[PDB]
Amino acid sequence: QLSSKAADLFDQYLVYRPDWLAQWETGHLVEGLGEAQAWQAPLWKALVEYTHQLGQPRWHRANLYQRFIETLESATTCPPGLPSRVFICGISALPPVYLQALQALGKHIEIHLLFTNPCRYYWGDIKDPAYLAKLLTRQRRHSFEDRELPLFRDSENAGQLFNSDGEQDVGNPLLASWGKLGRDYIYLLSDLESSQELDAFVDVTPDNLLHNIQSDILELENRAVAGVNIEEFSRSDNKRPLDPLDSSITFHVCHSPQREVEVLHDRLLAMLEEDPTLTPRDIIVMVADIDSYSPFIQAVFGSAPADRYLPYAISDRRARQSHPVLEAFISLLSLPDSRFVSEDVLALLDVPVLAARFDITEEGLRYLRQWVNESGIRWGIDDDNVRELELPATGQHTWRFGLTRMLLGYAMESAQGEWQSVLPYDESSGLIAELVGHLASLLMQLNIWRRGLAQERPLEEWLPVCRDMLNAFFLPDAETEAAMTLIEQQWQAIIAEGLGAQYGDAVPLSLLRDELAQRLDQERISQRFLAGPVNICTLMPMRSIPFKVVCLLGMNDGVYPRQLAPLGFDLMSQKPKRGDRSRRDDDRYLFLEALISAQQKLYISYIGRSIQDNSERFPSVLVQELIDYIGQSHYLPGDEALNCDESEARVKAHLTCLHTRMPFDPQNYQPGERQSYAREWLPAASQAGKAHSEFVQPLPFTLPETVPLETLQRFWAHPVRAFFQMRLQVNFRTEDSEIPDTEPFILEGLSRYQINQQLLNALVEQDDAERLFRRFRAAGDLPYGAFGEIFWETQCQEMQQLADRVIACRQPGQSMEIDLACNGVQITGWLPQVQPDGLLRWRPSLLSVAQGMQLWLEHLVYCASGGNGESRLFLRKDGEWRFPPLAAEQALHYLSQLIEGYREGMSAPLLVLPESGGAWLKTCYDAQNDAMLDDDSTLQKARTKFLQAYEGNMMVRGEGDDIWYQRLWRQLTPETMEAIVEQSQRFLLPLFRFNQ
Amino acid sequence: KLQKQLLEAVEHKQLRPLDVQFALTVAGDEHPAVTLAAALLSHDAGEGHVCLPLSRLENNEASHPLLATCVSEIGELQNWEECLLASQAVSRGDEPTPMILCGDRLYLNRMWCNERTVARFFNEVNHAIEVDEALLAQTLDKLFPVSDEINWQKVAAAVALTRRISVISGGPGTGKTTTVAKLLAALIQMADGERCRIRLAAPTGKAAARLTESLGKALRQLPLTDEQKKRIPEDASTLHRLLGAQPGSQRLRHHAGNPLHLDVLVVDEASMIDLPMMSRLIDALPDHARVIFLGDRDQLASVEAGAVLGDICAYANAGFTAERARQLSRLTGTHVPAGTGTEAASLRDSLCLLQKSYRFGSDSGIGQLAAAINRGDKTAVKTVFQQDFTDIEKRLLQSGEDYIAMLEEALAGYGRYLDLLQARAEPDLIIQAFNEYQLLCALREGPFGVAGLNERIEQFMQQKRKIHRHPHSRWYEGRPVMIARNDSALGLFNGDIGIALDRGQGTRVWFAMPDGNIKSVQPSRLPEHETTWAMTVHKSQGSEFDHAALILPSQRTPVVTRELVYTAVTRARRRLSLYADERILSAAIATRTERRSGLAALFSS
Amino acid sequence: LEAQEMLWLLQAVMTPERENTLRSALATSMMGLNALDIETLNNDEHAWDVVVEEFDGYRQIWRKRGVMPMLRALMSARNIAENLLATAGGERRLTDILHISELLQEAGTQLESEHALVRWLSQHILEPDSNASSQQMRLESDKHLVQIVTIHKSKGLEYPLVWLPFITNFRVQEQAFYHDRHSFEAVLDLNAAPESV
Amino acid sequence: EQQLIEDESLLRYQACADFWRRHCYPLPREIAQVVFETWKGPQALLRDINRYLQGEAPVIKAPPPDDETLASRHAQIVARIDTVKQQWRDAVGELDALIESSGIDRRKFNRSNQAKWIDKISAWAEEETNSYQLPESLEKFTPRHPLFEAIDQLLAEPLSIRDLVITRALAEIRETVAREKRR
Amino acid sequence: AELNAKTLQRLPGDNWRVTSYSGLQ
DNA sequence: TGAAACTAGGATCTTA
DNA sequence: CTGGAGCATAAGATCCTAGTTTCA
């Protein structure tokens, strides 16, 4: 970075100040200069000595120009090879060395130089009083006569010219504040000796506001009223009148850039509608930075329909022809520092070029995604890559571990067991397994190249690495050849300059990769600049094309002028001179030339108030000064004699128009002038359509005669969800959860629920848990080592406590068949593992009313089908659900109630909330008198218990946060609360009546 | 080491990346004998085989100096048993180790457990069911009024109701659906007071639908009592749907601890039932379940690695057991031949076969050549020389001058449907008229394949005035489509054929429902579709055309085999075609391949 | 809910062939179809044909001109932008919909492919950071509202009438991170010394 | 030429999990039990130390010496427990406590509970009735043996690894984050 | 209020391009 | 009555 | 060279008290 900055500074020295280089080539310093000379002069002298020692030619632009000027100052008229004439059109900044060279060459070739100064008279600075008499020369008109700055005797005599400084009395504050580059250029042009200068200054008739401003700039005057004396300050009829229907210059305060471009589009359509022979070629829209405005441009200009479409062409935007393979190659150069996160490697396989090279198709990408998600692949590619980061080599959760798991699962079956402490993966088993072979080929290539790209080699050995990367990882298609050739060209050019400059030492890869990435975004595109559409572009120096409508967008404070602070140790920032160029003066002069080049109408727009916090964000200083000048030199025709300040405030409020925050505001569509063309939002603004009807509708449903028991189980697991995905067959199936970042340190949720379920089902069978613990350890599911052992032993201690109680009340049993006839509706299905004492189920969870419902239904079916026995359930924290044996008539009556609830709930979203309604019913219903209570204190306790069960705490999720309820209602209204508690009381009271 | 040699072999395209990396990850840096054995065994399993005897590995010598690389240490290293069991990657079966060594044949542990389950089912579990001979013969001659000669349908029905597990082979066009209808009628009429959960199943959806409509028509045609007609099975389902296989996971809803609750099962078209599917179905059946399989003995092989029905029906030439031949002679009333000696009573009696073709026999040239293809090539070439029997053709397609004649002949065959399409045909008749002529092919890509043949034939009707296309459209009025992935919501199955014709209410694709109706689907709703002016032989199974036309490739391919030629011959109904060089066709018929399996070793012991 | 809602719309538009994932996005909260209307839609094959054709048109409009014009065509052809405004509590949902649309267009300009955008949206639903861009805008300032503001964000502002309902509330700090009363340092004490507490 | 970043939480979590991966996997079970009951995961550790890790680093009152490790600290605490265990097993079987009106006679059942509690020092948590031999507890209700004060000096200060693990984490995560952003 | 959106009646843009032998080819 | 351990229920857990 | 299948699941903890029961 130091060498690049120093080389840029030295090139700038070469162009701009050759005297310093001529001095430093000898070895002396320069007096009166800032710091950093003490290390910059020996650097330059050593560079000259080194480039002489390399045998490269000594000649350069610092010591060449003097010899060139001396050669052409005294010779024949035509030394051979010279052109007949050469034009310099539209450049308003040239170095003094270049101008000296041009006047030296001008005696031999006729050189036509074309320059657009906005002023007419002489508006430059002055060097010395002995130089002012030299400015008694004169421009010659093309046909008529000669003229210069007006009243040239007493103007030089008066305070127009300062003691040493520039023309302080130019008049026009716009010109004085902005033309900093133009003043230096005109001072350089009038300083030439042999130049023969001529003018062609076409006048502008002051009728419009814009033409008033342009004429004031041209004739170099100042019509702004300040009001030194009170008889001037009171009266206000001396400024020019402004037509209230005149819209040459307008300002548009907006809110957000999307709203800003939406306003601009409508105004351009209005301008095209008003002026008949205006075409979308002649309209330019100039943006402070195009990369942060282009998406909104594309969005609204594409969202315009066919009847209201005017074509756009976003020039000066950075090109991205094959962005995915560009990023793939940059990330592939970033290989040796990568930790190989599985998400990033799958984003690498998202590349179609590389997938086709390693023959994995889009069908196979989904299966690899699911297999990486489930198989436990998170970390570095090998064990060696884990050790290379100086970490403990655990072996598990690596890419090699996952691929070993996949291959071992192809050769194995998962029920057999581990082989080398790797539990095989049961999914990859058939013809789909060759995707694993292709993935392992990918990993072998990536591992070999991350080994190979590590060392530091000279540039001659860095030459073929890019070709090796491209032809080893990518399969060239018809689309990809452009990007691949461009990448090879840029890499070759970098190493070509490095080799031609005779560099010998070692070069690490990160340097070359950073240089390639920094060069790959320096190539803009502007092929479709003025090809016919509306020309969207960013503001660029020395590009002054006269258009009809100039629109400037995004002129907030700080955004424009675009800031570029100098390097600090630059030696032009300390002691500047005349022709020096800096970015602030550059951007100010571009604003001035944008004002001049607009021929018909102007459009300045800036963000007024931030849309988030509704704060205030000010316009740029340039727009503020323009508005101040307009207000200080105009007045509305009504208030002929009000005040200077009152007239200024009136015209400032008249010109600037605010804009609505959101497009469907009827202030947009109210008639007049600020009337949008967006017919799409007109019903939204005028409120011409009905609101949303309630989702609960009475649906026609007829109950069949054969209802399988799994239908009732799936229904009573969750009734509203069963209505959604069973009646009208909508299921809001959410996406898959993404790949976790790291290996499991702790296990929560489903990942431990499955472990507890398998452990409990093994422990009830009185089997040793060591085999299953080894199975999980080889699975890469438990935490590492001692932490895994601790977690396993505490889970063993809890499931042993549960399984003791399960064993103490268990008799071996078998299945049975179910076939009843309840209300004339047959029930089919099976019941698993019913024992002579009845139904036993064990489940590692907390006490849930939905599971109580499940056991109650499964037990009513059994008790209606004979079966004198009890039904028990065993849960965590010594939860329990016991039901006594009943009579057949009672069981059929209760099952009739459940089937009737099913047939109602398939037709309407039956409102049985199992957890919340269960908690409310448990609070209210008393098991002493077996009656429903009514006292207001217990009703209020049940109310707050129901709310605490509906919405949970901040770190538990209540039953409210579910899409099946959010689809029906958002905020729980008390009337629906009364309805749901009535339905839940109707349907859940057998459970709390018979729970013992 | 030898990793670079294996990568060289991979770049020579003689192995697979799976094969090389599986060998590397199972052997590590062990002796190269285990590495090479694992590589060849993985390639053998991936090709379609099951087992790998050692004599294959030291007698192939196809690509590499196996001895010159595998010589590593002391001892005469040709005792490959101990030379491979020394490493940790091969075991005898008592340990959880990938390569297994059971009968001096190395093969994968998954393949080992699947093959052992299949052999245990077909050797020990298949019991004998005893039924009264008098009422059995009463039912047989009530449902089979003909009593003149050896009726293989009578033999098949009798032996299938006799045994718990019964394979019924037979060529396509024999009356297997009729035999199954008689079988179910006999079983329902025999078991009256016992509830019988009859279930029908198939490996693919199109064959399942054909099975449903065929047995529906047949079982309504046979006369039964109303309670018997209640007891008739309602419908069939795809084998994964019956098993309860999850979409992504490899879990089964009908595992060994939860057997499916269905009493008797009919597995239609068990030729493409692969060996893992057979094992997973065997683990899903209860104790009192009886099954009857179907399918050809020598049809095209199973798509997944492992063939089972060919390895079962290889024992058909053994003949019946001596006592069982007398039993069948008692039942059917005629004489059945007996088999010499004895090999295995349970297998040799459980199997049956339908020798006598009844739809088209040897009198048809198609049937005569179909019988000849299973024999040597001399009978086939002699049969096609001798006067061609006026029902089969052959064109010597050798260059483009014959290729254009082939295209002309194809459009001549498609003429009726094409001119009906040009005459604005009605949907049922145009779908019926499309289903008589269909070109076939073996490869997919190239001059001989589905895409290439479709491109050339569509260009030929673009040049000769038959039907036009538009380069923006891709949907010209009259194209054929075949659905690749199954569609459950639309109720249309994989492999079904429809014609996209613009009736006037919008260009909609019309389909042939298996119940006779016509289904119209918007092309925006179609799951997948490919043009099928020529469709592959593997996609042709289960359907029968009226004029087939096979086009063999120019060179020798590993996909063209005697089985493929035979099933492409058997696809047509009344007229056949052929486009093959005689040398290539003779080589294809002569190369009788198989799949290395250990079932033949298990059954003999 | 609007992020998940747009995820369902994008998933349906990507593959309108699949009847289940089309009905899943049709039966949502922002189109506002009744259960009766979904029941009528599941039976009329002509209605399903025209809905699938319309969503195919949306897919073509997306693949031609980006995301936001497809959304705008969806608003203009389903009248949801006006239905949400008519339904109470709807300005908030409409502004959230437009904010998600702006974010989607800004991300889809750089993101080249189509399925990558849907994966991106699901990734941001799973990972909702609290940066500057994706903070919630105000619903409307023309609607005159009772502004609720935190004490810290209120610092520096000017309010006419102020309510402090919960000013007596407090929360005892048990953590031991105290400053020295002599040298004015940051003296963290790892132990639970009650003096430092 | 620099690039700004304010999404530093991913780096902080990666560095904290990296430290917990490097410095707590190679422990044996007898120390890993104590670490686990102090906190379960690196996310919990970062939730403890986040507000001190961000910003300017504070000054820990009475820092542990740099040359001390987790194994040495565990050995020190288990030796300190074993000393009191040895003393109480030596002097068990004597009475020097005045049975007051508020002092029940059945409280000597807690002494037998302590006797059954002393089995092995590999654990870390004592029985809650160890505060019944405290001089402050008994003065409400006579040393006669050194353990009556040894229990006092044992229970005056808590026995934990928290300070050591917090100090090592807060000293190493900062360095890891700084070096990673420098790279 | 009573309100409506103005309608542009003429064609907004012409038919102009700079072709690089692409439309002709 | 004084005391003293013990079972179960309860409440409360921020800020730009 | 190509066959297949849809859906559910989990839920915090630390701690001080009131009240209860037991006991000298």
Side-chain angles (χ1 to χ4, degrees), chain B residues 226-277:
Chain B
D226 297 329
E227 291 88 4
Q228 318 269 302
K229 276 194 298 184
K230 184 263 292 179
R231 270 184 176 96
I232 294 303
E234 327 297 321
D235 67 325
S237 43
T238 305
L239 209 52
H240 295 256
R241 197 205 151 283
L242 161 70
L243 280 192
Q246 276 302 285
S249 305
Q250 292 274 70
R251 50 168 278 214
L252 287 176
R253 205 214 311 157
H254 279 337
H255 54 88
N258 177 38
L260 59 84
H261 319 289
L262 288 148
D263 268 347
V264 64
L265 202 78
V266 174
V267 183
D268 174 313
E269 269 303 312
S271 173
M272 71 275 288
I273 298 295
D274 54 79
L275 196 146
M277 185 63 72

Side-chain angles (χ1 to χ4, degrees), chain A residues 487-505:
Chain A
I487 280 175
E488 179 181 316
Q489 155 188 358
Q490 275 297 320
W491 182 274
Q492 150 74 22
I494 291 171
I495 305 196
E497 311 266 350
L499 272 187
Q502 307 264 345
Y503 191 30
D505 284 335

Side-chain angles (χ1 to χ4, degrees), chain A residues 149-168:
Chain A
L149 61 86
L151 294 174
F152 68 101
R153 303 80 168 280
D154 44 352
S155 307
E156 293 182 358
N157 195 6
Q160 280 198 2
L161 286 192
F162 213 61
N163 58 5
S164 72
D165 296 332
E167 200 165 351
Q168 282 291 107

Side-chain angles (χ1 to χ4, degrees), chain A residues 612, chain C residues 99 103 106 120 124 127-137, chain D residues 6-7:
Chain A
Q612 172 142 343
Chain C
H99 198 358
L103 283 198
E106 192 173 358
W120 177 90
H124 276 87
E127 198 59 39
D129 208 315
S130 286
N131 74 38
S133 75
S134 76
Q135 279 207 337
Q136 283 201 261
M137 320 181 169
Chain D
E6 316 94 346
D7 291 331

Side-chain angles (χ1 to χ4, degrees), chain A residues 256 258 262 295-296 298-300 302-304 309 320 323-324 343 350 369 611-614 661-662 664-665 680-681 683-684 687-695 697 699 723 727-738 963 966-967 970, chain C residues 1 4 7-8 11 20 23-24 27-36 38-39 42 65 68-69 72 76 81-87 91 93-95 98 102 105-106 109-110 112 119 122-123 126-127 132 135-142:
Chain A
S256 55
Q258 156 73 23
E262 275 182 9
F296 309 130
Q298 263 170 59
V300 311
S303 169
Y309 183 72
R320 278 160 288 217
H323 179 48
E343 197 273 334
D350 186 74
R369 175 70 178 273
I611 209 168
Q612 172 142 343
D613 67 333
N614 213 316
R661 183 184 172 278
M662 192 56 28
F664 44 74
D665 201 1
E680 302 168 351
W681 299 98
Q687 283 157 351
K690 87 191 172 62
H692 283 289
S693 53
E694 187 79 4
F695 191 70
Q697 300 289 326
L699 277 165
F723 167 59
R727 177 63 173 94
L728 60 86
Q729 310 168 58
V730 63
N731 55 4
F732 299 102
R733 171 201 180 262
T734 55
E735 71 295 338
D736 190 12
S737 296
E738 62 182 0
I963 50 178
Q966 303 308 95
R967 186 49 196 86
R970 320 205 97 80
Chain C
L1 195 145
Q4 186 48 42
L7 185 59
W8 285 332
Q11 264 182 19
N20 189 359
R23 197 193 302 119
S24 178
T28 66
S29 71
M30 85 181 188
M31 301 215 198
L33 290 194
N34 312 307
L36 169 66
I38 307 289
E39 175 55 48
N42 274 315
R65 285 152 174 227
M68 171 84 103
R72 215 85 62 84
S76 277
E82 196 277 336
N83 281 357
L84 292 185
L85 261 175
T87 290
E91 268 196 342
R93 258 190 291 157
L94 196 41
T95 50
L98 292 190
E102 278 182 30
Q105 184 62 37
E106 192 173 358
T109 300
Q110 303 138 359
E112 303 281 333
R119 180 137 39 80
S122 64
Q123 184 178 2
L126 274 297
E127 198 59 39
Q135 279 207 337
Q136 283 201 261
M137 320 181 169
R138 304 331 161 191
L139 73 164
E140 182 65 26
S141 177
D142 208 311

Side-chain angles (χ1 to χ4, degrees), chain A residues 867-889:
Chain A
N868 275 295
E870 181 151 40
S871 53
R872 287 137 290 169
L873 191 58
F874 297 128
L875 283 72
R876 269 179 58 242
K877 288 201 211 302
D878 269 359
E880 195 173 4
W881 279 98
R882 293 194 79 198
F883 292 134
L886 288 161
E889 302 99 3

